[PDB]
Amino acid sequence: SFSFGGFTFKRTSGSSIKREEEVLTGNLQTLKIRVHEGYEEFTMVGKRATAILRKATRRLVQLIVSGKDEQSIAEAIIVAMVFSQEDCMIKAVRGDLNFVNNQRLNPMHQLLRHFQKDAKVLFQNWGIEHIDNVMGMVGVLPDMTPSTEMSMRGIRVSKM
Amino acid sequence: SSSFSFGGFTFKRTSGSSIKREEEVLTGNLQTLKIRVHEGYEEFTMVGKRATAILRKATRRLVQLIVSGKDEQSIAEAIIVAMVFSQEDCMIKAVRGDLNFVNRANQRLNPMHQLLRHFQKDAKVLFQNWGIEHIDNVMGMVGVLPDMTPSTEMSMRGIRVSKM
Amino acid sequence: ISSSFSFGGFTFKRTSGSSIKREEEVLTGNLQTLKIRVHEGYEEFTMVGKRATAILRKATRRLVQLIVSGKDEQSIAEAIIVAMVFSQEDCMIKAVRGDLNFVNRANQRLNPMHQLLRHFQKDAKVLFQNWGIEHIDNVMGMVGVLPDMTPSTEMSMRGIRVSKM
Amino acid sequence: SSSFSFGGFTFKRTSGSSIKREEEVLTGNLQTLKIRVHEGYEEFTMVGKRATAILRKATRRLVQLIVSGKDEQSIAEAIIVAMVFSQEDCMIKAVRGDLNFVANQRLNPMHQLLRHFQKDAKVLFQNWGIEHIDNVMGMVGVLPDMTPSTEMSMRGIRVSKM
Amino acid sequence: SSSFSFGGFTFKRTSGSSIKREEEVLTGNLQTLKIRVHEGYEEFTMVGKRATAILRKATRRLVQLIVSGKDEQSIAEAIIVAMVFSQEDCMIKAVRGDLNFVNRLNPMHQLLRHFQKDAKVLFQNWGIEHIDNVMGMVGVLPDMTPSTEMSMRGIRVSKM
Numbered sequence: 102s103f104s105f106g107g108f109t110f111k112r113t114s115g116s117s118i119k120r121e122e123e124v125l126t127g128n129l130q131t132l133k134i135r136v137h138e139g140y141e142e143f144t145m146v147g148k149r150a151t152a153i154l155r156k157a158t159r160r161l162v163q164l165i166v167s168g169k170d171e172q173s174i175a176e177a178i179i180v181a182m183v184f185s186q187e188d189c190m191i192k193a194v195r196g197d198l199n200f201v202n203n204q205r206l207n208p209m210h211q212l213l214r215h216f217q218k219d220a221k222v223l224f225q226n227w228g229i230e231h232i233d234n235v236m237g238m239v240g241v242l243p244d245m246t247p248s249t250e251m252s253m254r255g256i257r258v259s260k261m
Numbered sequence: 262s263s264s265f266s267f268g269g270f271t272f273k274r275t276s277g278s279s280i281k282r283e284e285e286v287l288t289g290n291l292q293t294l295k296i297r298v299h300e301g302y303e304e305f306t307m308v309g310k311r312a313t314a315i316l317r318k319a320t321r322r323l324v325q326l327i328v329s330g331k332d333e334q335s336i337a338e339a340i341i342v343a344m345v346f347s348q349e350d351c352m353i354k355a356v357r358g359d360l361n362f363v364n365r366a367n368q369r370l371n372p373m374h375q376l377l378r379h380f381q382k383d384a385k386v387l388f389q390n391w392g393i394e395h396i397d398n399v400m401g402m403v404g405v406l407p408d409m410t411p412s413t414e415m416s417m418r419g420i421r422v423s424k425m
Numbered sequence: 426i427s428s429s430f431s432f433g434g435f436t437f438k439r440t441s442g443s444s445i446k447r448e449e450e451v452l453t454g455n456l457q458t459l460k461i462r463v464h465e466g467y468e469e470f471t472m473v474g475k476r477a478t479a480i481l482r483k484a485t486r487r488l489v490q491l492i493v494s495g496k497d498e499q500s501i502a503e504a505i506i507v508a509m510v511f512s513q514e515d516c517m518i519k520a521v522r523g524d525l526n527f528v529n530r531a532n533q534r535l536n537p538m539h540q541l542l543r544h545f546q547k548d549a550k551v552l553f554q555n556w557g558i559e560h561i562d563n564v565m566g567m568v569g570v571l572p573d574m575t576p577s578t579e580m581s582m583r584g585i586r587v588s589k590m
Numbered sequence: 591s592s593s594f595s596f597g598g599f600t601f602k603r604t605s606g607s608s609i610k611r612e613e614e615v616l617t618g619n620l621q622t623l624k625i626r627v628h629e630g631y632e633e634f635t636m637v638g639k640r641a642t643a644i645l646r647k648a649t650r651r652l653v654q655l656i657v658s659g660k661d662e663q664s665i666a667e668a669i670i671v672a673m674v675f676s677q678e679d680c681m682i683k684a685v686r687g688d689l690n691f692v693a694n695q696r697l698n699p700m701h702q703l704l705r706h707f708q709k710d711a712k713v714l715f716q717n718w719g720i721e722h723i724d725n726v727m728g729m730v731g732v733l734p735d736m737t738p739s740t741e742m743s744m745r746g747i748r749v750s751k752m
Numbered sequence: 753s754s755s756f757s758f759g760g761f762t763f764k765r766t767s768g769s770s771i772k773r774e775e776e777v778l779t780g781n782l783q784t785l786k787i788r789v790h791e792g793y794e795e796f797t798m799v800g801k802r803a804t805a806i807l808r809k810a811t812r813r814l815v816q817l818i819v820s821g822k823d824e825q826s827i828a829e830a831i832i833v834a835m836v837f838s839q840e841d842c843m844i845k846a847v848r849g850d851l852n853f854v855n856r857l858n859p860m861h862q863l864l865r866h867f868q869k870d871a872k873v874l875f876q877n878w879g880i881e882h883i884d885n886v887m888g889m890v891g892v893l894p895d896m897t898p899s900t901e902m903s904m905r906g907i908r909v910s911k912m
């Protein structure tokens with residue numbers, strides 16, 4: 102149990118080792134981040150959203166989100182994309198990362214605030230996939246619009 | 262026929278049948294409820310002390326409800342009970358806050374009665390978010406708005422009040 | 426061309442339309458992958474069995490309409506089951522409970538479509554109860570039919586009618 | 591009865607009621623707006639200087655609108671106000687670019703939306719939805735370019751000939 | 753933008769208007785096409801050598817088409833052009849394989865040439881509807897057989 106981007110995570114399944122790694126942003130900035138290695142399954146519980154995150158080494162496997170509005174769902178998705186530590190998320194940063202709280206934030210909270218400010222490049226470069234339509238699951242598009250046919254890769258919105 | 266009691270009404274099934282399946286659903290406050298979802302078309306009469314009704318229902322869907330009652334408050338009580346009984350998502354999503362009702366003997370009410378008592382205390386969110394529809398003029402019957410005002414032009418989706 | 430064939434104990438004869446095929450992976454109600462050849466296009470068929478006959482309109486993974494004429498309600502139900510399976514609809518595939526592992530007399534797996542057919546012939550309750558119900562118009566010579574096979578002049582399983590002729 | 595002013599029109603509620611729920615929604619440019627979403631069926635008359643209307647509305651949905659006006663501009667102004675007022679998701683997704691309207695006082699989200707669409711209704715009108723209409727005497731349909739039609743109309747929108 | 757040639761047909765707009773927005777669409781094969789999407793209700797007459805038509809269209813939607821033609825192939829040619837021109841998602845999803853046509857054609861002419869070569873996937877997947885009996889007009893099936901009971905969604909053939 103822990104906390105990240107306004108969400109309480111609880112690992113329900115799996116495990117990982119934490120490995121320090123330098124990554125490179127889409128503006129060619131160098132970040133030192135603690136990379137988690139292994140398949141994991143989390144419960145995410147926020148104030149206006151909840152999600153099930155299944156996850157591997159630098160890869161989002163599946164996110165199933167419920168929320169009280171459009172914004173809250175968009176928050177969970179962003180948090181989960183940052184949390185996954187995926188390189189296409191890291192490559193989607195535009196400009197330099199200079200966020201402050203006058204103290205300088207850590208690389209993960211740096212990427213989190215950047216995408217919370219503008220999610221558009223993140224969403225529009227993540228990738229679309231054809232969906233199956235299993236029970237109670239709808240797709241969400243890069244413009245936050247729902248779909249029964251296409252979705253952002255590994256991202257589902259629960260209608261349950 | 263098979264009879265049961267729910268929400269102060271006797272239901273007797275007059276058409277159709279159903280199977281049950283356990284599903285996890287999420288309230289408007291994002292609380293998990295384990296309910297037995299009934300699957301299939303069914304028709305019921307509902308008989309209470311001050312109102313009666315005919316209900317058609319399908320899998321988590323109120324198809325149609327006609328209520329006959331002594332007064333508007335009894336009619337509302339019947340609509341509430343039918344809407345909860347339908348197991349509809351927009352009913353479940355109309356829940357505000359957590360559900361923690363208990364009985365005299367200190368036993369946690371089951372999920373369906375949890376929803377029932379919640380909406381028996383206050384049905385504003387449920388009624389206002391249920392859906393409104395255009396209706397045809399049919400003699401002997403009227404539409405009803407969320408504030409329980411009769412209407413010959415509009416009605417809460419699938420809900421009618423008998424003038425007989 | 427596939428305009429004439431046997432399926433589920435019924436002779437199908439195409440009377441309108443045409444189709445193309447595309448091999449597709451569908452997911453059952455127990456998360457089992459089935460490789461089926463999906464027929465794309467509007468088609469109309471007569472179905473002729475020993476105890477029932479029907480007219481079927483179908484499109485891409487959709488039963489458009491079915492009218493069944495039969496000797497008894499059990500035979501009528503058999504025809505409805507076959508037409509629903511044949512339609513390749515997602516709600517039929519999602520109505521599968523458990524894994525499908527049917528075998529013939531010689532010990533081979535049946536193909537996916539016969540896998541689905543034998544499942545629903547064993548028990549069609551989930552299929553019928555989850556298919557969808559609709560309000561019908563009064564049309565003389567025809568009635569609706571409920572999942573429990575009771576005739577109805579008011580409601581019917583979606584797109585399904587029973588002939589009184 | 592209940593009244594307020596919005597977009598230069600006096601709204602008077604003639605049927606129905608609503609409750610409010612504060613929500614956050616995303617524009618067609620992913621800008622977050624915090625709005626109070628009104629829930630429930632309501633009918634209003636709208637009275638302006640150059641047009642009047644009857645509006646039916648439900649939760650984030652324009653059910654139907656009939657407008658009577660002195661000319662095409664006045665009729666359009668009423669349609670724009672009714673679409674923004676409805677709080678429809680397709681209206682919010684029609685927003686192009688960021689909203690920063692500003693006495694120098696930054697407008698609330700609803701007036702943010704109103705001012706944007708009073709400037710440029712093209713995206714709003716062209717994306718709203720079109721429908722085939724029945725012939726009803728005393729009434730016509732209206733196309734996005736404000737041309738009257740007896741065959742098609744912007745979804746739920748009619749112009750009175752009275 | 754109210755008078756032009758497309759697919760061998762002169763289009764003349766008779767009602768409505770549109771705006772354009774450049775967008776990225778995905779083919780049934782996952783090939784990205786950059787197209788200028790026209791937004792708004794418009795009505796056109798289409799005049800070719802061997803067929804004429806009236807077309808109502810909206811944002812990426814064929815509302816209705818009526819075709820008058822000398823024979824089955826000329827009627828089919830007009831239907832194909834109208835369906836491509838409509839910019840519908842189910843036209844784009846009916847594409848099989850990659851598009852690489854050269855005279856390198858723009859996206860819309862890429863789509864057109866592809867469906868002029870093989871309309872089978874497009875016609876079979878377009879959608880079928882029940883129809884009303886209207887004298888002077890018939891339905892048409894994907895195989896181009898006339899029908900007085902069913903038709904490809906929104907498509908009619910004039911008997912005048």
Ligand SMILES: CN1CN([C@@H]2O[C@H](COP(=O)(O)OP(=O)(O)OP(=O)(O)O)[C@@H](O)[C@H]2O)c2nc(N)[nH]c(=O)c21
Pocket residue numbers: 103104105112117119135137141184185186209210
């Ligand atoms: C990506 N993360 C992050 N994380 C946990 O998230 C919590 C808060 O993240 P943080 O504040 O950005 O970093 P920090 O406190 O320095 O810890 P860390 O360096 O391990 O990420 C930490 O307790 C960390 O262990 C994770 N925990 C598990 N189990 N799997 C993961 O993939 C991840």
Ligand SMILES: CN1CN([C@@H]2O[C@H](COP(=O)(O)OP(=O)(O)OP(=O)(O)O)[C@@H](O)[C@H]2O)c2nc(N)[nH]c(=O)c21
Pocket residue numbers: 265266267274279281297298299300303346347348371373374
């Ligand atoms: C939603 N329900 C509920 N219900 C019946 O309503 C009564 C009260 O519901 P309950 O408090 O959930 O009791 P329980 O026995 O746990 O419910 P169930 O039968 O669904 O398992 C019971 O007699 C139950 O059988 C129903 N009966 C029919 N025929 N169709 C239905 O959709 C439903």
Ligand SMILES: CN1CN([C@@H]2O[C@H](COP(=O)(O)OP(=O)(O)OP(=O)(O)O)[C@@H](O)[C@H]2O)c2nc(N)[nH]c(=O)c21
Pocket residue numbers: 426427428430431432439444446462464468511512513536538539
């Ligand atoms: C779903 N089907 C099945 N089918 C035909 O039904 C017959 C028996 O079905 P099958 O043995 O389960 O399928 P099979 O022979 O493996 O292959 P296929 O479905 O690709 O034709 C075959 O001749 C097949 O062509 C069909 N024929 C037409 N015309 N339209 C259809 O939708 C379908």
Ligand SMILES: CN1CN([C@@H]2O[C@H](COP(=O)(O)OP(=O)(O)OP(=O)(O)O)[C@@H](O)[C@H]2O)c2nc(N)[nH]c(=O)c21
Pocket residue numbers: 594595596603608610626627628632675676677698700701
């Ligand atoms: C969408 N609206 C807006 N609205 C009312 O229209 C007026 C102008 O809206 P506004 O500028 O957003 O003011 P505000 O007080 O923030 O709106 P609200 O009361 O929704 O929080 C206010 O009196 C507001 O109460 C409404 N009144 C009713 N009855 N039904 C509605 O759907 C709506």
Ligand SMILES: CN1CN([C@@H]2O[C@H](COP(=O)(O)OP(=O)(O)OP(=O)(O)O)[C@@H](O)[C@H]2O)c2nc(N)[nH]c(=O)c21
Pocket residue numbers: 753754756757758765770772787788789790794837838839858860861
């Ligand atoms: C889909 N189209 C296409 N089109 C016009 O059709 C003609 C041929 O289109 P084209 O060969 O794809 O070239 P192009 O200029 O790239 O088309 P566009 O306008 O989409 O950018 C052009 O003059 C174009 O403006 C249209 N004109 C109107 N009025 N409405 C429409 O929906 C469409």
